[PDB]
Amino acid sequence: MRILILGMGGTIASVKGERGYESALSVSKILKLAGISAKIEARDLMNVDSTLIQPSDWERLAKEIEKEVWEYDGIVITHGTDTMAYSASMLSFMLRNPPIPIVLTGSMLPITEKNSDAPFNLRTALEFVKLGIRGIYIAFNGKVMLGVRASKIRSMGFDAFESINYPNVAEIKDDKLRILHIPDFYGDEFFSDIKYEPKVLVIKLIPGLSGDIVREALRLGYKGIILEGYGVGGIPYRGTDLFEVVSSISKRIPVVLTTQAIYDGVDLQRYKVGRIALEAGVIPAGDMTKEATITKLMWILGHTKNIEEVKQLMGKNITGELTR
Amino acid sequence: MRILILGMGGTIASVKGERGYESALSVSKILKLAGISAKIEARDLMNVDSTLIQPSDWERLAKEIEKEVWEYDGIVITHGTDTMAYSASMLSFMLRNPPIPIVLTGSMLPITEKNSDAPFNLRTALEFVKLGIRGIYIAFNGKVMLGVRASKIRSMGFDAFESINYPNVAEIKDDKLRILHIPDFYGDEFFSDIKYEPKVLVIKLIPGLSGDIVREALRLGYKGIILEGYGVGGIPYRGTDLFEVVSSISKRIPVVLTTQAIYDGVDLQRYKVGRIALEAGVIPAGDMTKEATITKLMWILGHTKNIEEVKQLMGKNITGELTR
């Protein structure tokens, strides 16, 4: 059992510097502070403060994993929690059909604070990686979730991540990691497509919102747009020019409609506003997580800019991110 | 017992139509069609579809309620679920110190459907409005929540609304509405502060996001910007001009930083990145719901544009929306 642990930074690598928490620990030091020591090779790719991860970092990470995926039985990645779901999802699209278990983890409190969750999360990730279930996951607060289905719903409590609209892959019961179900949508060939278009915009739909910002986003050069709507989905065509503007922008760049809600997702077929929105050209996000949605659109935009192709790829279940 | 019931439209009043759902049923028909006809009285202010509500409507509803607050003991407002939290939140700020119980309800399925939750939700609203507990709430799936604290977390199931970072006011136990606690932050004198500025925009922070869209919102005339952050709080400054742009714009227009996570809220003192954001001019949204945060900023902008004043009020516990 040979395991590789890559560091990305985050709270798990943070410490109080009188100026609040700030990334300061290397991966090897994180492991020792946690009291962990199977052959484990620790490596620092970078040590970025939480909230500072950028798309560029996904590329570096993907390339690193790509050249080690055949030299290890499992890979664990210590990451900041704020953007963990983004990284997990983007990696899932870039590294399809991984041969080994790749699991991202982190913590809500640095290893230096009491009652820290870091050791527990490190332990759980390592425990899961020894089970041999390939794919990309997130291990947090005693659970292992498929990365592309994970979302951060809490900003402080220990149970910050939840598998949305999909069941947990593994859980701790009677002090042991029990497998609940094995994700089975992986093919044979492992291919890497480390290509994407980072410039997309995510706007929340609020009552009274105008389309001027959408028109301006196209002019600024955004290659795609995601609107966070209400309930099951629909664009307002009353009192504002939002609808007429979207009907036009959606023919030049993809305009994806997602939900402000956390559970259940979108279904543009349900209400009249939804059907009208579907006519304007908005692309449905199904039951995908916000993170999977955003990263998928970026990934897709890195391969094509044809609205029709984007619409089809968006509604396609590429790596278990959506239920059809 | 003299209850007023206002209709705003919504799913609860929709009919399968042909091009999907669309409200059509009246407030009178809804009541009778729910095994309920106590001295009540129904009145329709409007019958807006699934997501067409706009700030103007909040003013009409506010004044329509103000000139009736004394002639009744309680008010129930049938509403669409998509923006119910928005309306409830805005009313809380506009109608301070309500002397009677004002409850908003709706349903995920139209009464004109088998196994609809509308009857149950209506009965819970009427049941609660007879307990003399004043304030502005939302009743739904057997719970009564402080309106300025309710949020729509589910887009399909019946348990769509939830009290965020605050306990429910009433719940159903052993088939009876039980009061769990009475909000007291209310004063005695009743007054209305019906004023607001509707043009604010909300954009979700995502890795790699540029500040270009924030600079353009200012030029376009937006009077306030709300950034939906990652977690605890922080504005990226690595590989992006976002932090640079926000540092200057935050001195001309108020830019608020809230969190993407549904629970726990924000705290700009935890990480160094947060302290840096706080010093650059951004305004913390505390643990407020996204809906309360957005409506509160619109409301505040209705009488001032001074950055410091809006920062001060955004931080003030006006009507139960935040935990100081």
Side-chain angles (χ1 to χ4, degrees):
Chain A
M1 185 56 66
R2 209 201 174 204
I3 302 178
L4 176 70
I5 299 180
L6 305 170
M8 291 299 273
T11 298
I12 189 156
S14 299
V15 125
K16 35 180 156 65
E18 200 73 5
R19 288 229 55 175
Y21 310 139
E22 43 189 302
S23 63
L25 274 27
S26 77
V27 187
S28 59
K29 248 58 180 177
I30 283 178
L31 299 179
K32 291 183 180 59
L33 290 165
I36 303 177
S37 62
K39 258 289 74 181
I40 304 175
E41 175 169 348
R43 185 141 80 226
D44 300 295
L45 277 186
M46 55 187 92
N47 188 1
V48 183
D49 287 64
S50 285
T51 76
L52 272 35
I53 291 293
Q54 64 187 309
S56 166
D57 298 314
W58 298 325
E59 177 157 42
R60 173 72 176 298
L61 216 199
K63 292 183 304 175
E64 195 67 10
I65 295 172
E66 183 193 12
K67 80 182 185 190
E68 301 294 1
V69 99
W70 302 111
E71 302 295 316
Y72 296 90
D73 309 302
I75 291 174
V76 174
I77 297 164
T78 51
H79 196 100
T81 64
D82 299 309
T83 69
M84 200 178 294
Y86 287 102
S87 292
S89 296
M90 182 54 87
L91 288 189
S92 302
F93 296 116
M94 301 182 298
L95 305 173
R96 275 175 297 173
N97 301 323
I100 62 179
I102 301 174
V103 46
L104 291 69
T105 198
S107 59
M108 298 308 287
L109 292 170
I111 317 191
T112 60
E113 252 62 301
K114 66 169 184 177
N115 308 163
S116 180
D117 51 321
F120 184 46
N121 293 332
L122 265 328
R123 245 142 40 207
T124 297
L126 290 162
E127 182 168 2
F128 174 89
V129 150
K130 254 109 73 178
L131 259 36
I133 293 68
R134 65 174 183 148
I136 294 164
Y137 311 76
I138 286 183
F140 217 88
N141 190 49
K143 308 177 305 186
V144 185
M145 308 158 272
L146 190 58
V148 85
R149 289 291 193 162
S151 269
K152 183 173 181 176
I153 64 185
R154 258 178 277 281
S155 67
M156 284 180 219
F158 292 114
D159 195 46
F161 286 91
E162 172 166 349
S163 186
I164 293 179
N165 301 153
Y166 191 83
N168 285 155
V169 166
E171 298 180 7
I172 290 181
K173 295 175 186 179
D174 303 346
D175 317 308
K176 226 54 179 295
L177 239 196
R178 251 66 283 297
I179 297 173
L180 289 72
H181 84 86
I182 299 170
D184 57 2
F185 45 73
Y186 297 111
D188 292 332
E189 178 178 6
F190 161 82
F191 27 43
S192 75
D193 281 282
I194 315 173
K195 186 156 58 182
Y196 62 91
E197 168 54 277
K199 199 167 187 66
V200 297
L201 179 66
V202 177
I203 307 168
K204 182 183 207 79
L205 249 48
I206 59 175
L209 198 263
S210 166
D212 49 7
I213 192 63
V214 175
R215 191 201 315 293
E216 218 47 40
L218 209 214
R219 188 186 70 71
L220 269 350
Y222 281 83
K223 307 301 166 49
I225 291 164
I226 293 169
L227 309 185
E228 213 178 312
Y230 322 115
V232 290
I235 310 301
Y237 50 86
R238 173 171 176 273
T240 66
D241 64 338
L242 213 213
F243 179 76
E244 54 177 293
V245 173
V246 170
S247 303
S248 175
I249 299 298
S250 71
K251 297 178 185 181
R252 165 58 102 276
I253 58 174
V255 177
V256 176
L257 216 199
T258 193
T259 325
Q260 261 166 52
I262 313 300
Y263 306 104
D264 306 351
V266 171
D267 170 45
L268 294 181
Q269 221 61 59
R270 194 56 182 294
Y271 297 86
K272 179 178 175 293
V273 294
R275 305 210 183 196
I276 296 173
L278 203 60
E279 301 301 59
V282 309
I283 301 175
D287 65 350
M288 291 191 280
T289 55
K290 318 293 195 66
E291 304 88 348
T293 293
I294 290 161
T295 52
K296 189 183 184 176
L297 188 61
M298 290 188 180
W299 187 75
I300 293 184
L301 265 29
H303 299 69
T304 180
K305 62 179 185 178
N306 174 69
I307 307 301
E308 269 272 59
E309 279 196 87
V310 171
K311 189 183 196 308
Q312 299 181 300
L313 279 165
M314 214 61 193
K316 184 182 181 184
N317 187 359
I318 303 177
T319 7
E321 75 285 349
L322 72 87
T323 311
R324 285 185 60 176
Chain B
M1 200 61 85
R2 178 180 171 60
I3 305 175
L4 176 63
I5 296 187
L6 304 162
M8 291 297 280
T11 289
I12 180 180
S14 296
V15 296
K16 280 180 282 297
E18 62 289 305
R19 203 179 189 182
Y21 278 171
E22 56 179 297
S23 55
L25 206 48
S26 79
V27 188
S28 295
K29 300 177 76 176
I30 294 178
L31 286 172
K32 300 169 188 176
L33 197 54
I36 191 71
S37 290
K39 172 55 185 177
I40 305 181
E41 189 186 71
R43 185 186 309 167
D44 305 68
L45 294 192
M46 55 192 94
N47 224 71
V48 189
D49 280 14
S50 194
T51 69
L52 283 42
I53 293 297
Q54 48 179 174
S56 317
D57 303 313
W58 295 328
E59 182 178 63
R60 295 161 56 184
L61 174 57
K63 287 169 183 170
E64 182 73 47
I65 291 175
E66 176 176 46
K67 58 75 165 293
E68 297 283 40
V69 63
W70 294 119
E71 291 211 0
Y72 297 90
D73 316 295
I75 301 181
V76 173
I77 303 179
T78 48
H79 199 293
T81 67
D82 281 355
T83 68
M84 201 180 295
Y86 286 106
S87 296
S89 298
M90 187 60 99
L91 285 189
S92 293
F93 296 119
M94 298 180 146
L95 305 182
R96 295 191 82 296
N97 299 321
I100 57 180
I102 302 173
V103 185
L104 295 73
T105 339
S107 61
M108 304 306 283
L109 298 175
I111 26 182
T112 181
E113 195 91 13
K114 272 285 184 175
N115 307 303
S116 176
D117 50 322
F120 180 45
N121 288 177
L122 280 156
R123 303 201 232 86
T124 304
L126 291 166
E127 183 171 354
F128 175 86
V129 66
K130 297 173 185 173
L131 278 58
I133 306 180
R134 57 169 184 161
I136 296 171
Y137 314 73
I138 285 184
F140 211 91
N141 196 218
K143 304 181 299 182
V144 185
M145 310 159 256
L146 188 63
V148 74
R149 285 288 189 168
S151 216
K152 186 185 172 74
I153 63 175
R154 235 180 295 287
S155 73
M156 284 178 220
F158 292 93
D159 198 29
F161 286 92
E162 185 162 303
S163 190
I164 301 315
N165 312 313
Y166 188 92
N168 294 312
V169 183
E171 295 185 8
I172 296 187
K173 309 183 73 62
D174 301 306
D175 303 303
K176 275 298 175 187
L177 240 193
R178 187 87 76 69
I179 302 303
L180 302 179
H181 82 284
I182 164 184
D184 61 2
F185 48 70
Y186 291 104
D188 292 1
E189 58 171 358
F190 166 66
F191 64 96
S192 75
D193 202 342
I194 307 177
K195 45 77 171 169
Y196 63 99
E197 207 318 305
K199 205 167 184 61
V200 310
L201 86 160
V202 185
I203 56 194
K204 181 191 293 297
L205 295 189
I206 61 174
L209 210 223
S210 163
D212 57 353
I213 192 63
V214 178
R215 153 165 43 66
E216 286 305 300
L218 180 68
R219 177 179 76 71
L220 244 48
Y222 282 84
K223 306 189 189 310
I225 298 185
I226 290 175
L227 266 31
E228 228 183 76
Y230 294 134
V232 61
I235 294 181
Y237 55 68
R238 177 165 168 285
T240 173
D241 70 332
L242 179 65
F243 172 93
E244 173 189 294
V245 175
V246 175
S247 290
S248 61
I249 275 58
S250 77
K251 301 175 182 182
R252 302 185 60 57
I253 240 66
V255 345
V256 180
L257 181 58
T258 186
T259 180
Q260 157 255 37
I262 354 168
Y263 308 112
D264 304 343
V266 117
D267 167 27
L268 282 63
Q269 220 70 215
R270 204 142 302 180
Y271 301 77
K272 185 172 63 47
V273 288
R275 319 255 265 234
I276 286 180
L278 197 290
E279 295 164 0
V282 308
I283 302 177
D287 68 341
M288 293 186 293
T289 58
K290 279 96 95 301
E291 303 95 329
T293 296
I294 297 171
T295 57
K296 188 178 184 174
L297 181 69
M298 290 182 171
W299 173 68
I300 288 171
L301 256 24
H303 77 68
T304 182
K305 293 309 166 66
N306 179 80
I307 309 299
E308 260 309 298
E309 201 187 319
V310 33
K311 177 180 182 175
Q312 253 164 57
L313 288 168
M314 280 298 283
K316 268 198 58 179
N317 189 186
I318 309 291
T319 178
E321 73 284 353
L322 71 75
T323 308
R324 71 181 181 186

CSV table of all heavy atoms in Angstrom, one decimal, chain B residues 11-13 21 33-34 106-123 158:
chain,number,residue,atom,x,y,z
B,11,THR,N,-47.9,29.3,-6.7
B,11,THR,CA,-48.3,27.9,-7.0
B,11,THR,C,-49.6,27.5,-6.3
B,11,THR,O,-50.4,26.8,-6.9
B,11,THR,CB,-47.1,27.0,-6.5
B,11,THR,OG1,-46.0,27.1,-7.4
B,11,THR,CG2,-47.6,25.5,-6.5
B,12,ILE,N,-49.7,27.9,-5.1
B,12,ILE,CA,-50.9,27.6,-4.3
B,12,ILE,C,-52.2,27.9,-5.1
B,12,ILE,O,-53.3,27.3,-4.9
B,12,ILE,CB,-51.0,28.2,-3.0
B,12,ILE,CG1,-52.2,27.8,-2.2
B,12,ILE,CG2,-50.9,29.8,-3.1
B,12,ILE,CD1,-52.3,28.5,-0.8
B,13,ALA,N,-52.1,28.9,-6.0
B,13,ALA,CA,-53.2,29.3,-6.8
B,13,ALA,C,-53.1,29.0,-8.3
B,13,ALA,O,-53.7,29.7,-9.1
B,13,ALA,CB,-53.4,30.8,-6.6
B,21,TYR,N,-47.6,25.1,-15.3
B,21,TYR,CA,-48.3,25.8,-14.3
B,21,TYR,C,-48.3,27.3,-14.5
B,21,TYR,O,-47.4,27.9,-15.1
B,21,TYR,CB,-47.7,25.5,-12.9
B,21,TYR,CG,-48.2,24.2,-12.2
B,21,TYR,CD1,-47.5,23.7,-11.1
B,21,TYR,CD2,-49.2,23.5,-12.8
B,21,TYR,CE1,-48.0,22.5,-10.5
B,21,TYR,CE2,-49.6,22.3,-12.2
B,21,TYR,CZ,-49.0,21.8,-11.0
B,21,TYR,OH,-49.4,20.6,-10.4
B,33,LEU,N,-61.7,25.9,-1.1
B,33,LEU,CA,-61.1,24.7,-1.6
B,33,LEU,C,-60.0,24.1,-0.7
B,33,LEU,O,-59.1,23.4,-1.1
B,33,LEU,CB,-60.5,25.0,-3.0
B,33,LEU,CG,-60.2,23.8,-3.9
B,33,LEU,CD1,-61.4,22.9,-4.1
B,33,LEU,CD2,-59.7,24.4,-5.3
B,34,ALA,N,-60.2,24.4,0.6
B,34,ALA,CA,-59.2,23.9,1.6
B,34,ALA,C,-59.9,23.6,2.9
B,34,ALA,O,-59.3,23.7,4.0
B,34,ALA,CB,-58.2,25.0,1.8
B,106,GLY,N,-47.8,29.3,1.4
B,106,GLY,CA,-47.9,28.9,0.0
B,106,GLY,C,-47.9,27.4,-0.1
B,106,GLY,O,-48.4,26.8,0.9
B,107,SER,N,-47.4,26.8,-1.1
B,107,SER,CA,-47.4,25.4,-1.2
B,107,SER,C,-46.6,25.0,-2.5
B,107,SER,O,-46.4,25.7,-3.4
B,107,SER,CB,-48.8,24.8,-1.4
B,107,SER,OG,-49.4,25.3,-2.5
B,108,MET,N,-46.1,23.8,-2.4
B,108,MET,CA,-45.3,23.3,-3.6
B,108,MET,C,-46.2,22.7,-4.6
B,108,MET,O,-45.8,22.6,-5.8
B,108,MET,CB,-44.3,22.2,-3.1
B,108,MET,CG,-43.4,22.6,-1.9
B,108,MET,SD,-42.4,24.1,-2.3
B,108,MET,CE,-41.2,23.4,-3.4
B,109,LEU,N,-47.4,22.4,-4.3
B,109,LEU,CA,-48.4,21.9,-5.2
B,109,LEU,C,-49.7,22.7,-5.1
B,109,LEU,O,-50.1,23.1,-4.0
B,109,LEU,CB,-48.7,20.4,-4.9
B,109,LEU,CG,-47.6,19.4,-5.0
B,109,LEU,CD1,-48.2,18.0,-4.5
B,109,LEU,CD2,-47.1,19.3,-6.4
B,110,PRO,N,-50.3,22.9,-6.3
B,110,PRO,CA,-51.6,23.7,-6.3
B,110,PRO,C,-52.7,23.0,-5.6
B,110,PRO,O,-52.8,21.7,-5.7
B,110,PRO,CB,-51.8,23.9,-7.7
B,110,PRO,CG,-51.2,22.7,-8.4
B,110,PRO,CD,-49.9,22.6,-7.6
B,111,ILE,N,-53.6,23.7,-4.9
B,111,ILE,CA,-54.7,23.1,-4.2
B,111,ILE,C,-55.5,22.2,-5.1
B,111,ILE,O,-56.1,21.2,-4.8
B,111,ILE,CB,-55.7,24.1,-3.6
B,111,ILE,CG1,-55.6,25.4,-4.4
B,111,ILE,CG2,-55.4,24.3,-2.1
B,111,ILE,CD1,-56.4,26.5,-3.9
B,112,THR,N,-55.5,22.6,-6.4
B,112,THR,CA,-56.2,21.9,-7.4
B,112,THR,C,-55.4,20.6,-7.8
B,112,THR,O,-55.2,20.3,-9.0
B,112,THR,CB,-56.4,22.8,-8.7
B,112,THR,OG1,-57.1,22.0,-9.7
B,112,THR,CG2,-55.1,23.2,-9.3
B,113,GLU,N,-54.9,19.9,-6.8
B,113,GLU,CA,-54.1,18.7,-7.0
B,113,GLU,C,-54.4,17.8,-5.8
B,113,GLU,O,-54.6,18.2,-4.7
B,113,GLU,CB,-52.7,19.1,-7.1
B,113,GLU,CG,-51.8,18.0,-7.6
B,113,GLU,CD,-51.7,18.1,-9.1
B,113,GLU,OE1,-52.0,19.1,-9.7
B,113,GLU,OE2,-51.2,17.1,-9.7
B,114,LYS,N,-54.2,16.5,-6.1
B,114,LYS,CA,-54.4,15.5,-5.0
B,114,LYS,C,-53.1,15.5,-4.1
B,114,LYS,O,-52.0,15.6,-4.6
B,114,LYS,CB,-54.5,14.1,-5.7
B,114,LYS,CG,-55.9,13.7,-6.0
B,114,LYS,CD,-56.7,13.3,-4.8
B,114,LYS,CE,-58.1,12.8,-5.2
B,114,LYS,NZ,-58.9,12.3,-4.0
B,115,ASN,N,-53.4,15.3,-2.8
B,115,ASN,CA,-52.3,15.3,-1.8
B,115,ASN,C,-51.6,16.6,-1.8
B,115,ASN,O,-50.3,16.6,-1.9
B,115,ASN,CB,-51.4,14.2,-2.1
B,115,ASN,CG,-52.1,12.8,-2.2
B,115,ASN,OD1,-52.8,12.4,-1.3
B,115,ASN,ND2,-52.0,12.1,-3.3
B,116,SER,N,-52.3,17.8,-1.8
B,116,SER,CA,-51.6,19.1,-1.8
B,116,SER,C,-51.3,19.5,-0.4
B,116,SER,O,-52.1,19.2,0.5
B,116,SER,CB,-52.5,20.1,-2.5
B,116,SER,OG,-52.0,21.4,-2.4
B,117,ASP,N,-50.2,20.2,-0.2
B,117,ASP,CA,-49.9,20.7,1.1
B,117,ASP,C,-50.5,22.0,1.5
B,117,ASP,O,-50.5,22.4,2.6
B,117,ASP,CB,-48.3,20.8,1.2
B,117,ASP,CG,-47.7,21.6,0.0
B,117,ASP,OD1,-48.2,21.4,-1.1
B,117,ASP,OD2,-46.8,22.3,0.2
B,118,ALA,N,-51.2,22.6,0.5
B,118,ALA,CA,-51.8,23.9,0.7
B,118,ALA,C,-52.8,23.9,1.8
B,118,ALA,O,-52.7,24.8,2.7
B,118,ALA,CB,-52.6,24.3,-0.6
B,119,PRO,N,-53.7,22.9,2.0
B,119,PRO,CA,-54.6,22.9,3.1
B,119,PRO,C,-53.9,22.9,4.4
B,119,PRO,O,-54.2,23.8,5.3
B,119,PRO,CB,-55.4,21.6,2.9
B,119,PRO,CG,-55.4,21.4,1.4
B,119,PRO,CD,-53.9,21.8,1.1
B,120,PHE,N,-53.0,22.0,4.6
B,120,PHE,CA,-52.2,21.9,5.8
B,120,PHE,C,-51.4,23.2,6.1
B,120,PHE,O,-51.5,23.6,7.2
B,120,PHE,CB,-51.2,20.7,5.6
B,120,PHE,CG,-50.3,20.5,6.8
B,120,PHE,CD1,-50.8,20.5,8.1
B,120,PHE,CD2,-48.9,20.2,6.6
B,120,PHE,CE1,-50.0,20.2,9.2
B,120,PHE,CE2,-48.1,19.9,7.7
B,120,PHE,CZ,-48.6,19.9,9.0
B,121,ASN,N,-50.8,23.8,5.1
B,121,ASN,CA,-50.1,25.0,5.3
B,121,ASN,C,-51.0,26.2,5.7
B,121,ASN,O,-50.7,27.0,6.6
B,121,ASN,CB,-49.3,25.4,4.1
B,121,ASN,CG,-48.1,24.5,3.8
B,121,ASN,OD1,-47.3,24.6,2.9
B,121,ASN,ND2,-47.8,23.6,4.8
B,122,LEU,N,-52.2,26.2,5.1
B,122,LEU,CA,-53.1,27.2,5.4
B,122,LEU,C,-53.7,27.1,6.8
B,122,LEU,O,-53.8,28.0,7.5
B,122,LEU,CB,-54.3,27.2,4.4
B,122,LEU,CG,-54.0,27.9,3.1
B,122,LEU,CD1,-54.8,27.3,1.9
B,122,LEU,CD2,-54.2,29.4,3.2
B,123,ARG,N,-54.0,25.8,7.2
B,123,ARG,CA,-54.5,25.5,8.5
B,123,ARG,C,-53.5,25.9,9.6
B,123,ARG,O,-53.8,26.3,10.6
B,123,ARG,CB,-54.9,24.1,8.6
B,123,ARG,CG,-56.0,23.6,7.6
B,123,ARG,CD,-56.8,22.4,8.0
B,123,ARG,NE,-56.7,21.4,6.9
B,123,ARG,CZ,-55.8,20.5,6.8
B,123,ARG,NH1,-54.8,20.4,7.7
B,123,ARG,NH2,-55.8,19.6,5.8
B,158,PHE,N,-41.7,18.9,0.1
B,158,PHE,CA,-42.6,19.7,0.9
B,158,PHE,C,-41.9,20.5,2.0
B,158,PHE,O,-42.4,21.6,2.4
B,158,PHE,CB,-43.7,18.8,1.6
B,158,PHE,CG,-44.7,18.2,0.6
B,158,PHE,CD1,-44.4,17.0,0.0
B,158,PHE,CD2,-45.8,19.0,0.2
B,158,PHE,CE1,-45.3,16.5,-0.9
B,158,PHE,CE2,-46.7,18.4,-0.8
B,158,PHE,CZ,-46.4,17.2,-1.3
